[model samples]
Target: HSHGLFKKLGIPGPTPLPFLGNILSYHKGFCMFDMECHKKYGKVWGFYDGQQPVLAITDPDMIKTVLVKECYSVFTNRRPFGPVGFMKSAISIAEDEEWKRLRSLLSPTFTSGKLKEMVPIIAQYGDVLVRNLRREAETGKPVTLKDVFGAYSMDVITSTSFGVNIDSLNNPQDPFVENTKKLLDPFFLSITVFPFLIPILEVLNICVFPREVTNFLRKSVKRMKESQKHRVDFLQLMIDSQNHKALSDLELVAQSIIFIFAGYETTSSVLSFIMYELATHPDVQQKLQEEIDAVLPNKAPPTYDTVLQMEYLDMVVNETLRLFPIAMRLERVCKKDVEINGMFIPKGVVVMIPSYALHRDPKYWTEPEKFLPERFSKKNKDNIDPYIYTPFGSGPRNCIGMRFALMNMKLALIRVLQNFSFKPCKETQIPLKLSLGGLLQPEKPVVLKVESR
Candidate 1:
């Protein structure tokens, strides 16, 4: 380790090993790594990923600086994408100008008006979710929310992305689930464990892990060309986008993978976590139901504008995200040498904003570990830093699907509670542990008993 790496610069962090630095520490556990770093090194720190310097920042005001839009042209990139052939085109990993252009192309589909059109699709899927849960609930067995949400969110994305519902919530033989495994699962595994293979994978253009997913994308695009105008899902938006440059076939296919992978994972995980919280805190669930009943009286289909007005519904969703920011951390790489305040930074340096830790900071919330939804009350939020509650991240690089994700979650809960009540089953684990694979998730299923309310 360079003895003076952070000592000379006065940045705080644990001492790093010579070439390995904190790579082993990170590979150990992403969640624990951030928690440990914040506790030992305080709010601002410098560590190493081998010889390359990495900054771990948790200070809210400093986060406001790092995610500042004024400096985007210089500190514009999120960490590099996987080296697999088509992985680079994803909006999450696309760099600088490419990121800007792709964000432009992707933004319209998530607009308020566009989302209004998808409410029925999401509600229709939510109905399928509750219907299936009811079947298992009658059997008096614990319903695993992960598998249930997996199938439901997949059905929603398939409808939104492909202009057709494969009804993944009900289908067993459909290759959609297998297609997801072929592309999303393997690509994320490589991104997390074998990053070195990315460059090699990219150089060889060898992303045919199963061939079915790409084959589906290409074939779907070709088949829809004549009937594109009638299509309303994400793929049609891309095909018709008049943004900076029209998407190349490969780019369109790559984003379709993003919509399926990230879209499915984040929404489902949050919904599962919320259900777990609701089940465990029956009083909170009851209170939320009272709010839901009043806002959505008469069992009317949830309206986009109406859901926005449900104050208690908003608090539960906000609190759930605070406890589990599934993306965990946000990263941006420097493109050119720059300085913030008095700190000098060089090109290619990686900067991380630890959202999970930020959300749990004791300075911002009382009983930070408890499931307290009132922490985000309008009056309470007035005293908090906006940067401190970033589950979807902040700034120009914030999540493109944030609005869509929130809407789907609200509707799912609105529809779920309307028919059912969730309670912890015997199999439910009280203290949840983070899983090792992919983005952070519960180590096991969130097992809960469901009942017709």
Candidate 2:
């Protein structure tokens, strides 16, 4: 592609090299392809995927055009599975016809009505989290929010996704939790830097997790299959789907694994980030406390309805997601040759929406670096481009477990904030940095002092 065509198309990309294309430059961290392209190329940029030319779109209108109006014809299918062998036929890995069918079949399980019925099970885990934090408070010790929240998320997912109440909050060292952690750790590995090697690794049966971790996961799966007890969680949903001839054993294992990963990791990261922001921004923290206190004063635990009514609490969580989105990036691959913004794109080129960059873009947000929950207020939210703020992604491929994730996060925050106030402890890191090969974590453990109300 000519420089002029790339510039006119508003694509942000560095000069390409032979063979390796832009791979070397994109991995160095300082000169990220997406961030650097945006800085130099404005809103759009083009680079090469090996020999194939590709384009990145950041403009809201163009993004909508690609993901909404022309999604089927342009980004026709999801990308192939990365090195993780366990996810090939999962909902996230399925593409084209398979993706459409699986998504439709699983949609009912995550609906608002179904999630409402699962609320009590989710809330039970939230209670466990609060009790654990309260125990730490009694000793006047700081609570590591990430570790605590991770346990809570583990309990909810194992219970709801596998129909096994592993009680991970009480038994934080459960075998299932260890394996789940192992399965998800690869996302942060350098292996992900080369997307092509992912499928090859899977095909070769290269070990991603240690032998013990894999064995633990296999045992857990087998136990669930052999049990004939009735349960109303995602596994039960899978069983029902099977009875209706909608899913196969292999497909069920793949989807169930995805559900467990999704249920635990993302929600825990979000809650931890919210807690960090709340500790740092005490004014917003106090505002949330007041709202919570008004509804459940005298230290009564939060109820389902009361937690739902905390408007300011909702704003705080939304703003935290806006600032430190756990997913950090959303990616798609072109399935057919198509044109976007007057430039041609060939099939197999990967497209990424750098959510971290978009969330902080100056053109779309004022004081983008500031932690301002008021920005998401109903009136102010209407002023911003909707596409610029997609924490759960958008369109047909939006997160299926969004309702369940949000409820778990909200309930955990409410339970903790109801009885305690958090302030940065001695070990707390100011100006958190993202981990190199880990999920969106504070560069160091976040230590916060919990003061009883």
Candidate 3:
């Protein structure tokens, strides 16, 4: 019963049980649990992930300290609990010097210049997406935007990351699509629920992705490397830098695979959530469409520069991200025992910034639950604390694909809204229940009726 860690540290938190330790309370996932805990325990509190003590920080100043100021030294690594098999080598979980090396090597792939070169590749898939959805819209039926966006996301990630253009939008039975779906489908609830079992699972050779899925990814990366032609994609950039960075074949594969993992569900979920918000709020959708129309005149495809000019589009995307931030928590493992904002945190404790709860906190936001894009407008945004509203995360180790993801989302929105408008259908879930797993996904399908504009 030595799980009295929070009590010893004089931290406020819910009473965590012996073996369970607040794991069962997460039945509705971290999205709700975090909000509930934030309500009960205030900004800085302690909780247990099984027996492991976790410090959840929502205080903007504390978050700023952890995520930005002391990020590189005091809190450099994420919890090394769940990365299994090849995931062990992923840049997301890689630690210390290894993480530094990988991050430096991979940083250039998502640069403004790099992303500009990748727009046409992304827009081509967006065209395919609009074409596929246009037919569905014509039938006057509700379309599950998650499923539609999932394919689009996969298509974008595959083409951009690996230069393998598998049109999963039209061809639903593509092996890459099928495998990726199966890989992300489970959301690894077992490990997330039982944090104690991660080591055992790792020892047992059970990976997050199914063995076949891992094999497919590994083999596909190999094939792409062998057949690597000159192209302006992420793969081409990494492949060119392989010699300079001294990246091994396995490292290359891991980086490519990590791109799919990082870029896929997060982007797709955000896109789905954006549509859901727009569908429910018709005025926002109309305004966003007007901005899109104004920017992209004569039904033209969105260039990288033109999409950047759409202010309302960015606001809508930002508000959606604030509401439904895909990654439930931004986590970091403490290296040395330290005190942050009068809370004594020991080494080896995991610190989490639950962005969902922080974003919705009434202290920071006026109407927390409402979809208000104007909150991010030029005048209003100046009042916002950047640490409290992190969608792509904050600090030096924030999402490397931030620009890439935004470009993809913005371009897709421009393309889709160019031809169609989203409206709340009979089947649409009004108050969306987030899924059980860690990711902030809708429990029900985000079915929205699309109309030809």
Candidate 4:
């Protein structure tokens, strides 16, 4: 009940306030701050969020046990914010059985075969993107890379996940794109992070999805169902699964929205960052281009096998995720008391996995801050710890969208890098300082130039 609760239990950490504890220090709001904490403290230490004493675990071996094997039942959910009800329909938020059901039904949908069905749909959108990329190259617009990629990601996700082509790149004003961005706006999201506010919000039994946002999705899916031209994509699988009574209509709605939000933000953010990396490091870009060129010799479109099989392209994407993890803070709540190598974590304690810190650790990575993609090269990769390089995370509950996201990224990168080259414009951030409020974000709108290669 007190700030020193961890001390009584023999856990060591920075001093905490009676109520606020470790939160105020997070005002700078970067995940790397947690890394800084790891630097100050040891690998295993206690961090209090309000009166809650969270065990921040950074040791990869410890993480492997906690996330991979040892106590899965106890660490069933993420830090208590996920797809539950209308709010928590996505697998990311789904708890226990719901998580099991959704993951089970959804896992098969992203296999090589099903993903093949979605590729042309994604490629069609990528072609549309290049047409506009041509325009940006000609007009010389101050193309904020994230926004550009956000629009492209929106198009791809809508086509694959929802069976529509909103073409957010050109049709940025589409209702689906508009409402989706509003729902994910960081200002609104910041409210969800304030633990103190949740007590009151939970008491009110608040609507998880905003009225317009939820309504748009429900109506859209219903319309898509009745239409004669119903497309067979990810949303179709969701509908078929729903009809089997596998999941509720509301869960479907939340899940659909989760896919949209996740597919839109994570891929877009990552692709733009990858483009930034490509721009900033031309040598890496040329080497990657050579790989892509070898794969698609005739400047032909990338195939599923070619995209996924390209060793160097995979390395670049891996390194980008290492440098800039989508969500830096990896956490799981303890459902039951379970003792680990040296510490006894009580039930209900949130276990913080410092993913950003772990990825950038000097001990694990030689020149961790350097942008060396070769670290993931075949010869050297064996020397690396799998737990240490978690771009999509590890364990059973890792990113379901990993294959989907990577495929989309590779497809787009293949198309774009083959046709065009990226260079940093004025707005590009050297040593990009991440935005302090929400999840991973570039502090400023990332600008880059698109030149025809």
The candidate that achieves the highest lDDT relative to the unseen native structure: 3
Q: Write the per-residue lDDT of candidate 1 for residues 1-453, one digit (tens) a residue.
A: 343557777787777776566667766567778777877878678877656677877756667777875446766787765444655788877887888999888889888998888877777788788778788878988788878888888888878886666666567566556566443254464454445666676677676344546667666756654452455578777778624678877787778877877778788889999998898899999999999889889877898888999999999999999998887888888777777655766677788888887777787778888999888788887877888788888888888899988988888889889989887877787867667654678878788888887
| Candidate 4 residue lDDT tens string, 1-453 | 656767888877888876667766777674756877878888778877766678888777788877888645777688765222357667888788778888888888778788877767788878888888888888877677777777788778877766766777777676677877774244334443455665566556565555556776788877765465655588788788776237777777777777887887788888878888888899999998898888789898877778877999989999999999987877787888788767787888888788888888888889988899999888998978888778777898888888888898889889888898877777677878778765788888788777886
Which candidate, 1 or 2, has the higher lDDT?
1
My TM-score estimates for the predictions, one after another, are 0.92, 0.88, 0.94, 0.93
- For candidate 2, write residues 1-453 as lDDT tens digits: 332434454555676665556656645342144566778877666776445456667878777766677776667555444555555577887887888889888998987777767777777777777777778888998887767878888788888875656656567576566657664243433453455566676668764444455445555676777555565688787778787337877687778777876777688778888888888889998998888888878866665577678888889988899888777776678877777766676566667677777888888788988899998787786877878888888878888888778777888788778778888887777777656433456667677788777
lDDT for position 372 in model 4? 94
At residue 332, what lDDT does model 2 achieve? 76
lDDT tens digits, residue span 362-453, model 3: 99899999999999999897978988889888888898888888888888888898898776877777787667765677888788888887
Best by TM-score: 3
Off by over 4 Å in 4: 82-85, 184-199, 203-208, 227-231
Ranking by lDDT: 3, 4, 1, 2
Off by over 4 Å in 1: 1-4, 181-198, 208-212, 227-231, 436-438
Colliding residue pairs in candidate 1: 1-18, 83-198
Backbone clash count for every predicted candidate, in the order shown = 2, 6, 0, 5
